[PDB]
């Protein structure tokens, strides 16, 4: 009813609890479009509605944060999503970005190549990704789980994310993976979110809140993608740009959260309760250093 005055729509809890089989996707809209304000690009409006929904959850925010961003270049030679992320975060925060082809940018430091040649020495408080390949969509053969750049992402999280941190990662009907749905059961809460300015497509963002380092429930990833296609096929959504006109409350609030270092045998039920409500981070606090690998035969 009043859905057209929000920034978007999230998946309800009773659809997550069923046992369905997989089918083809077919939407009632498709070839409709929204009306944008004078002179504004489509990817500036999409990143503004995602940051307005994250302001309603329980994230941790310390003195001297650290953030990293994959898939950030474009076919024009510049970077629009990196300029919206630096307007939202507090002054003093450090930020790094990357892609497979060359481009120009506003971040503190930048690297060029395939994602499997990248290495770092320290740990991070938040991670964002928009990578995609268009040769995946074909309606003439069967629809199976995919590998490629999804195999690198599952390993980076288990080795270099701090206890207490968060993530957000993009998918579609034919671009998806079954162990990534199984790792959402190692956080305290999870969902899937759709923006009101691109609602005639099958795109969404997969989100995890406050990390614990071991399993809390068990999930089968082939059955949970088929429950997500059933929801979209029986509930249609109306297109809108109302929320881009009121910006008086946009910036993220400074909480001052505390930081400690601890060894694997000191974690008791008092500690585990503090991580679940957004009030503690665990890692070391030294300097930051990075690099990239090069092959010689020329």
């Amino acid at each position: 009813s009043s859905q057209a005055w929000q920034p978007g729509v999230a998946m309800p809890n009773l659809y997550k609890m069923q046992r369905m089989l997989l089918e083809k996707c077919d939407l009632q809209n498709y070839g409709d479009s929204a009306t944008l304000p004078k002179g504004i690009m489509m990817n500036v409006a999409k990143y503004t509605q995602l940051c307005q929904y994250l302001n309603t959850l329980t994230l941790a925010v310390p003195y001297n944060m650290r953030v990293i961003h994959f898939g950030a270049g474009s076919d024009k030679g510049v970077a629009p999503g990196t300029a919206v992320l630096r307007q939202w975060l507090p002054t003093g925060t450090l930020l790094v970005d990357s892609d497979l082809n060359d481009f120009v940018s506003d971040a503190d430091s930048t690297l060029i190549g395939d994602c499997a040649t990248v290495h770092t020495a320290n740990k991070w408080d938040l991670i964002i990704s928009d990578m995609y390949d268009p040769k995946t969509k074909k309606v003439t053969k069967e629809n199976d789980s995919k590998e490629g750049f999804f195999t690198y992402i599952c390993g980076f999280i288990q080795q270099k994310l701090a206890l207490g941190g968060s993530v957000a990662i993009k998918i579609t009907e034919h671009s998806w993976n079954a162990d990534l749905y199984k790792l959402m059961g190692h956080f305290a809460w999870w969902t899937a979110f759709v923006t009101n300015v691109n609602a005639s497509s099958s795109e969404a963002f997969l989100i995890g809140c406050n990390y614990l380092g071991k399993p809390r429930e068990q999930i089968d990833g082939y059955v949970m993608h088929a429950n997500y296609i059933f929801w979209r096929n029986t509930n249609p959504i109306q297109l809108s740009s109302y929320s881009l006109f009121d910006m008086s409350k946009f910036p993220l609030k400074l909480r001052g959260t505390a930081v400690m270092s601890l060894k694997e045998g000191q974690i008791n039920d008092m500690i585990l309760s503090l991580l679940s409500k957004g009030r503690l981070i665990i890692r070391e606090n030294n300097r930051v250093v990075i690099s990239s690998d090069v092959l010689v035969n020329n």
């Binding site: 510049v78 120009v104 503190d108």
Partner: protein, 114 residues
Amino acid sequence: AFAVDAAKAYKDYLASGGQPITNCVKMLCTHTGTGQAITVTPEANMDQESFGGASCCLYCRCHIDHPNPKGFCDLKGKYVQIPTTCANDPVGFTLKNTVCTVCGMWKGYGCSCD
């Protein structure tokens, strides 16, 4: 003793009637801000628009050296304000005007000292 001078090949290309540079990046904001020229967050008023800094610099966009014993860019990593009746060529506006070192406004379009 030879070196190239590209600030003046653009000025002569426009005077014969060429098309200005495109795809500079514009932002959403309240339009009740301060009015000054270069800042750490957006500050436009009722007569202005605001843009991201790297996409409006001539040396960054052509892939060449910055004119300074120690290459230093004045714009990368910040935000810049432009008057609404000149917003079809933002690269040309910044190459021609100068800032006041006392109040922070553009000379000709805001400063009221002398």
